[PDB]
Amino acid sequence: MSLATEGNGKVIHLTKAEFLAKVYNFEKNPEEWKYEGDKPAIVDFYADWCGPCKMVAPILDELAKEYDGQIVIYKVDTEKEQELAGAFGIRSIPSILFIPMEGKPEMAQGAMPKASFKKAIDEFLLKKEGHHHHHH
């Protein structure tokens, strides 16, 4: 049945329920952050009525496919996921949550271009020089 359902190397918009299961349990972890993901994730907080929020989807699709295998990109519809976005203090949009496999996730506000995104994805999410890195 599921031989090739994409998803990996893609950007999927999900709900807080989907967030919960594969990303983060804000039920058991009201205050803390336990990542349930196996690969590094990038969560785009977007609102369709927002221009920038629209741009990031194609950008994210591009970079997701470019960095396929290693990363998995998501996005969340803040207009409905108000509780989810509000919990992190995101307020609304745009916010980009970079979730490492080590530590807690950083965020960048707004839909930066393919170039700035590559730097944040590659040289930060994979090249986590700011995570546990003092020299060794």
Is residue 77 within 8 A of residue 48, CB to CB? The reply is: yes
Q: What was the structure determination method?
A: NMR
Picking from 63, 9, 5, 17, the residue whose alpha carbon sits closest to that of residue 39 is 9
Catalytic residue among 14, 23, 42, 53: 53
Q: How far is CA 43 from CA 40, 53, 64, in A?
A: 10, 12, 12
Q: Looking at 12, 20, 47, 50, which residue is catalytic?
A: 50
61 is catalytic: no
Q: Known catalytic residue: 22?
A: no
CATH number of the domain located at residue range(s) 1-136 in this protein: 3.40.30.10
Distance of CA 134 to the CA centre of its chain: 25
Rg (CA), the chain: 14
